[PDB]
Amino acid sequence: STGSATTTPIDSLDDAYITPVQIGTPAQTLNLDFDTGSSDLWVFSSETTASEVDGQTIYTPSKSTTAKLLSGATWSISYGDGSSSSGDVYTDTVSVGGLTVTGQAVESAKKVSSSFTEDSTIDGLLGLAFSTLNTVSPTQQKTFFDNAKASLDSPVFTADLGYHAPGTYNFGFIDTTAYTGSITYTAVSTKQGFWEWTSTGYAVGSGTFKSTSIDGIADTGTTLLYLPATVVSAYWAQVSGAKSSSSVGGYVFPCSATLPSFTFGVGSARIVIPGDYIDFGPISTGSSSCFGGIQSSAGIGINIFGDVALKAAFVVFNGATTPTLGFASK
Template sequence: MAGNSSSGLADKIKANILKFCDSDHNKQPDEPTEPNKPTTLPTTDTSNMAGTFTKIPVKRNPNYKAHGTKSYVYALARFGFNPTMDGPYHHSTKIAQQGKFADHAGQKHIGGKLRFSHGLSKKASDGTTGQVSSDDIQNDSLYLTPVTIGTPGQTFNLDFDSGSSDLWVWSTELPSSLTRNSKHNIFDPSKSSSYKKSSGSTWEISYGDGSSASGDVGTDNVTIGGLTIENQSIELAKKLSSAFQQDTGDGLLGLAFGSINTVKPNPVKTPVDNLIAQEDIPKSAELFTCYLGSWRDTADPDKGESFYTFGFIADDLTETTGEISYADVDKSQGFWNVKSETYTINGKQATQSGNTAIMDTGTTLALVSDEVCKAVYGAIEGATYDSTQQGWTFPSKTTADHLPTISLAIGDKEFTIAKEDLGFADAGNGMLYGGIQSRGDQTFDILGDVMLKNIYAIFDVGNTRFGALQRTEPSVNLSIPPSTS
């Protein structure tokens, strides 16, 4: 189990928080809050934060290759939902056995216990069904963020994922045949004086395609953008399936809530849990923020750059925006789940009563109901559902004035997805794979990078709410996504 962060962390936060707290954002616990009411963005002078709080630059993975179907299959494997539109990929149930086969009169009988195994399958063109291979799925991360672990620090490029709660890294516990010539940064606990092994604790992540990662657990110091968490639980990879081996990143840092952490026999405190564990840290500092850029925006003022912050909200965004709209978060399933009951296409609003959405930095696409998908692509001339690619596509020659203006609700306010983000990847034959796709029979929307690139996202842990600030693009770049985004 992870311990508390250092008192030095609390002192740093208290010293810096005075630079940006305002009366609304710095409410005391006994003051009522209005989660959905737009508020003035608190400002922060980050120029004087060297050595304390800084923006954490996010690297765009140079090896990432945008592929619509593979990204969709990744979401299928990860969340386990069943597709409601035709396509080669689907979930199937198989009978597995625990025990041995017995041969009686030439007939095979299963001994031991029966169990049902749910997995992702692929239907071939001849109608036969087979297993999904690592080549069928997007196994690489688009965004990677540096994190330092141990004493002295060892630096790793991790996938920051607000849809999961494990912090795992490549480690020396992996077979030497895998690490010997690897380009990954490998965590060596023997070289950290602050590392402690957590006896008896193990972890395992497994997806519907059969891919998995697992290993042992320890605690160590973790530094993220000038913020150090002592005795943070670290999950050391001991086994990685081929799909996990293909990822350019050195592991994952989950930013969801601890209830979906996979450590056994007892879940551990996540970095998010430890962020709010300090009783003397103001609630206004119990947050992290996310600003994701795009390869299309290199000519824009932000140069397409991306960053995270922990403990403060960046002030420079107030120059062009200035208001955050907050939405209550339902964390009962471990996700950043918010109400999302309306959407607007070309000025015409529609309602989906009771609909919700999770804000997920670990998913590239925006996955919504079939109703919304049909409305979106019904507004684009020449758009069609391509069952061979299991996704909606539209002509790459479509100009900006022929693309719809689409807004999705986060809480009580709608946020617009830039037209340039409607095309996710080249689908061949003069078509683009859409950035908005079907969530299948999933009961909530999954708003990934396609939406998050259009807002400044505030994950307010202390107040259990999600804040969003609309971003606008000074220009529209409809270039066909390159093979390496």
């Protein structure tokens, strides 16, 4: 089997991407944030504290003839921004782009933090990291991909995120028309539960390539590109007036700037992030200070190849017995 679904930016900055997901019988379609950096499929639901729901579409298990309470199971998760959610668990039928999994754990939120409530466009998350990170207790649950894998034509999914435009998540096949040149594959460590890999270096603008190993995660659920302070300083030094602002919480730059590109290495191959991808717009409405899309990972504990990086590539998440990652230009 295969599946193919379009993923759409939630706003004009590509702060996140939403993908429609069918849950239950009859189908209830929710728009979920596909997150290769976590491993829980959780939704706003009829059980979510009413004051914490503001415009989201909810899953109502009592209206699904295939929903079953997973008795005793609870979940609770925190994210990279200090946002969180928790609740109980159902199993139900879940379909993405024509690919159906029966008995998928659907984690129903009883509580969500303000950041989730405030974002009307995201109805929940669909985790695509390794199932070892799944938070369901006392019986850990599998991701949608893990459940689908054996049935897929090939045990892979691909992320093809757009810049200020829709893109695609495919399951079970590689669309050879969706990228240019060849796909370069690189080793993955699953030891921390992430799609963790090692970039071979970087360049800033038309500058020379610096060969240096940068361990990090391929994370569709993080907006920005988080890299070591040395690398990030080298980038922003090429932008007149750019500075790190403790008050704002990262590098800012004059909105009048033209940003240089940023290149990262995948083995001997190179992925070029155009400068425009690195602009996250005014820090507050009407400001002439703009927020940077490349930020320091210092104090996170890991480097994160988030949407800024991934959207410059066609990315293969190869879930074969020994997982790997593939990157192609597009």
